[PDB]
Amino acid sequence: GNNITIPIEITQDAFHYISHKDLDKNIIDKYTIRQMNEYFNTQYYFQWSDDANQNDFYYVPNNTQTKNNILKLENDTIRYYKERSGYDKNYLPHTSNWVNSISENMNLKSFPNIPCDNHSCRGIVVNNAQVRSLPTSDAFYNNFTIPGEGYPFDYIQLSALWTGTPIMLIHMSTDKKWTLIKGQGTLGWVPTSSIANVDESFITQWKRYRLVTPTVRKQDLPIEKYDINNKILEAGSILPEHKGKLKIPVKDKNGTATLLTVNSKNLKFTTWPMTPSYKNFAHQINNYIGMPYGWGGMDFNNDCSGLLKRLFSTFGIWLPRSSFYQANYAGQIYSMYDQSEEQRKELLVEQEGSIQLIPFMTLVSFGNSKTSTSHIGLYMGTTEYNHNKVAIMFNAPWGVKLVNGNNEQGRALVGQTLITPIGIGDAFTEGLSNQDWALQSLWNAVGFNTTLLTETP
Ligand SMILES: [Cl-]
Ligand SMILES: [Cl-]
Ligand SMILES: [Cl-]
């Protein structure tokens, strides 16, 4: 082998993990969701605020522990790939100079080259966009025969941003085909055709509309008589609605956004934020199960942290983009680095802990050192599995690490969003060991943390 599939372990229905008496309840109360929704609006609209600028980028808006100089990050990214060999989108070795043409097109000597007088660089996403660390659709893969490498691990791929996302326009490539933007806690390059600037009137009118959000993962927007293409509406989008018809921003001939009314008779959406009931969380969780794992949002399929950010956005609860920032900045992190497997299971299974964990409101994160994270999921409580009570989580994992007798690595592949035991694949440890593969249990991760969400920053 090397990459070895493992079966799905537990029932793929969030309602299996919700007691009947909780069905009709909300997970958090009115006061708490109001505070979370206010925080969401501050973070989500930060690029339209007077506080934001074209030089500084925050993984968590207004938290200066997360502040970065954009030009430095751009130069760091160029340097990172100039210094490396890898493989392209067709699995062919990159030419030795392939970054040079990209660096030229980035034209950083003119940074930032999009003027911003009267806040004219405020903008919006008009087509769902794959945010890229460099302005190229070409990939950077490590050797695709190495477990954990090849597709979907294109390291240029950073995030998936949905139509409607408030952004700021920073800098345009020399060929004008790419624009460097920031929004939703992400910085990077997108096709220029996927974004548009917005004017003061656009923002004023945006704030007067009722907003809606889709209730299914993907759906097709109507193709009108003169449309050239179908458009896909993705869960997580937040868009105006008037008289029951969705409005979507489209790029006008002058490059600015204007709202277009969509014929909405067959569309599936609801007023945003969605009510944070156990029922609604269950429906939304169920809609993501089976979505392929997409590193960095590759091909509009989410990764571990992107899945959670997306789910919570439907409810007006804001998480940062990546697992480390979620674990450390969505709440007060509790590190179990100094605690044994037995102690970790005592907390998550029996709730024997110094703290109280909350199903559907606690992130569990895992990593290879005390402070780093390489996986995250949403704690969902416990279930009976193989006549044992096990802790469970909603998550998007790629695969669990395996090691053979020669200390070579492998993966027990999952590759899709699922509800899983915390110890993904632990049930298969004995069978794997008989074929000389030792599964590295998530319960034994060097870094292992819980973060409650119920405290808004
Ligand atoms: Cl920012
Ligand atoms: Cl994403
Ligand atoms: Cl487990």
Numbering used by the authors: 21 to 477
The authors write:
The crystal asymmetric unit contains two PnpA molecules, which are essentially identical (root mean square deviation [RMSD], of 0.5 Å for 457 aligned Cα atoms). Analysis of the intermolecular packing interfaces within the crystal lattice suggests that the molecule behaves as a monomer in solution, which is in agreement with the molecular mass estimated by size exclusion chromatography. The PnpA monomer has an overall structure similar to that of DvLysin, namely, one N-terminal “c-clip” or “N_NLPC_P60” stabilizing domain (residues N20-N133), two SH3b domains (SH3b1, residues I134-V218; SH3b2, residues D219-T295), and the C-terminal NlpC/P60 catalytic domain (residues P296-K499). As in DvLysin, the PnpA c-clip domain has an extended helical conformation which surrounds and stabilizes the SH3b1 and NlpC/P60 domains, forming a planar assembly from which the SH3b2 domain protrudes. Compared to DvLysin, the c-clip domain of PnpA harbors an extension between helices α1 and α2, thereby forming an additional two-stranded antiparallel β-sheet (β2 and β3) and a 310 helix (η4), which protrude into the catalytic groove and close one of its sides. While this topology is generally maintained in PnpA, the end of the groove opposite to the RT loop is also closed by strands β2 and β3 and the 310 helix η4, creating a narrower access to the catalytic site. In PnpA, the residues that make up the active site are C324, H395, and N415, the latter similar to the equivalent residue found in the active site of the prototypical papain, but differing from the histidine (H408) at the active site of DvLysin. In the PnpA structure, the thiol group of the catalytic cysteine is oxidized, resulting in the disruption of the characteristic C324 SD-H395 ND1 hydrogen bond and suggesting that the enzyme is in an inactive state.
